[PDB]
């Protein structure tokens with residue numbers, strides 16, 4: 001029952017729900033079964049960066065993920081987000097673990113949305129940038145097991161005292177202000193997001209992944225969305 005558009009960094013291959021047989025980046029439109037994927041050579045324990053871009057003229061949601069000293073991965077999907085999402089949304093980060101586990105640490109997150117109207121003074125914009133996260137980060141809405149401030153970072157899923165990731169965990173952080181992504185006088189609407197993340201696991205098979213997502217403003221974690229559902233979807237439809 002929420003509406004979800006997401007870019008997933010999916011670390012575990014669930015081949016019965018359509019994943020390819022390797023870690024991958026994907027574009028999810030109202031379903032965990034990605035509309036488009038690309039292979040991702042995820043590196044356990046290294047800091048990675050993902051970038052997400054869209055605009056209402058081209059109507060193409062694109063993402064790129066990379067690590068220093070490595071080649072990038074990229075995915076794009078043609079989708080008119082004015083037909084999928086409401087006029088006002090919230091934007092956020094989500095991650096989960098299941099039987100298999102990893103840390104889902106966010107070290108920085110930035111976002112910019114712009115609406116240009118046909119007026120003389122055309123520009124409307126929202127921008128935020130976090131390069132550290134406090135214990136009490138009042139402009140984020142934390143859901144589930146998400147916490148901020150441990151080492152100045154945002155830990156989307158549970159990590160024990162000694163730094164070990166926990167299984168069967170799910171958490172999200174959403175920016176506190178609603179974001180206006182369509183307006184009747186806008187001639188161009190666009191957005192960009194970037195986040196840096198550290199996925200580490202003591203295991204040879206980490207799971208489940210991190211996603212950037214855009215949702216209805218009152219979105220909440222679906223019941224039972226640990227593991228393969230990434231904190232985003234109530235089922236694998």
Ligand SMILES: [Ca+2]
Pocket residue numbers: 010011012013014019208228
């Ligand atoms: Ca998966």
Ligand SMILES: [Mn+2]
Pocket residue numbers: 008010019024026032034
């Ligand atoms: Mn997937």
